[PDB]
């Protein structure tokens, strides 16, 4: 007898599976995606964007800024020692 009409009806496979949710996510995310992100920090300029760039970038974490930062406070109180003495 005469075949039923379901095989030629589709209209809820688009909620029917899980990658639909991911699809509607990644059509927004990827379509308006940039090839590369914006920045790993770069502001501190006054001849100190260089200080941050050399020391406090993702390029390295090394003891050089620590030494520098320590020395600033040492220079304050060391001069003040002779202001107190």
């Amino acid at each position: 007898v005469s075949t039923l009409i379901p095989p030629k009806v589709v209209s809820s496979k688009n909620i029917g599976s899980a990658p639909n949710a991911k699809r509607i996510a990644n059509v927004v995310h990827f379509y308006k995606s940039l090839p590369q992100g914006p920045a790993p920090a770069i502001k501190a300029n006054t001849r100190l964007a260089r200080y941050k760039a050399k020391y406090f970038d993702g390029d390295n974490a090394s003891g050089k800024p620590l030494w520098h930062f320590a020395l600033g406070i040492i220079a304050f109180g060391y001069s003040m020692e002779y202001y107190f003495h």
Partner: protein
Amino acid sequence: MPQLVPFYFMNQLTYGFLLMITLLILFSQFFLPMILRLYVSRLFISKL
């Protein structure tokens, strides 16, 4: 000890408690939520 007996106890202490209130607000509204951006961003990346 002169470092425990100035006459400036309340003066110092005023500037001290001011630093605490400043930092509390500073963390709470600014710096803690920028770490929470890392958390939430990771969970969105987890979803994708």
